[PDB]
Amino acid sequence: MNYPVNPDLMPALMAVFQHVRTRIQSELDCQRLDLTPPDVHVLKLIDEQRGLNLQDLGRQMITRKIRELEGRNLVRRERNPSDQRSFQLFLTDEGLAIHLHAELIMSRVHDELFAPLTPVEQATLVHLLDQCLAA
Amino acid sequence: MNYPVNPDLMPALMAVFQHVRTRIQSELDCQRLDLTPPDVHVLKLIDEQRGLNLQDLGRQMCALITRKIRELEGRNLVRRQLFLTDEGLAIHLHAELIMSRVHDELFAPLTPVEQATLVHLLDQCLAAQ
């Protein structure tokens, strides 16, 4: 360590992380979407990796959860062309629409979080957050 | 007052979160604690609310928690009303040390003024909500 850390920094950061989760969840709930962070994560992986195998989803995170998502018409399982006993994962039209809607919710929550800052302030914040990682 | 939003901010914040999440898990594994953050959350609630019942704990965590509680019990970290054992108390304390250290290491590259500036900007964001 060079100097003791400011004792308010970890809590101030945690509060922002808390705000983002709380707001996203509240919006999802207000909007009647019945989605949890695990749901959002699963939809994102399936969209990002079309035809994802179940074990590969397992690695990046389940059979019960896919069953739920399939029943809600968000995910479709197709047989693996080489292995008829296993299934690969795809978003339905509805599941894709919901994934992209969830993404727009997340970006709006961030926009609303940051918009009270002036452009100079926002740029300073980017720099400081980046400084934490760059080093 | 609402300004246009810098498109680097959400990714910058997300990157910090993901870095910290990864580092905490790496340090828990480095110390062979065999815990994940949800496990520590259970231990922390049991520590803070010593004697609370299983149903109550389950609700606060928000079958599957009973599985985790049973796993923590099988490791003699939790005893039965729920209490941390001596081993559970020690491992919870060690996890907290790790959480604190990872955050110290996160903010280390910032000078005291940078640290104070970051506190202020994070506060300003929140206060306007």
Partner: peptide, 24 residues
């Protein structure tokens, strides 16, 4: 016990939960 004071305290308390489950 002001707004951001309370949020900081609550968030610090929930740190394991927040890193354990998030949309990030």
């Amino acid at each position: 016990r002001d707004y951001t004071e309370q949020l900081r305290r609550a968030a610090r308390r929930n740190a394991w939960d927040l890193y354990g489950e998030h949309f990030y």
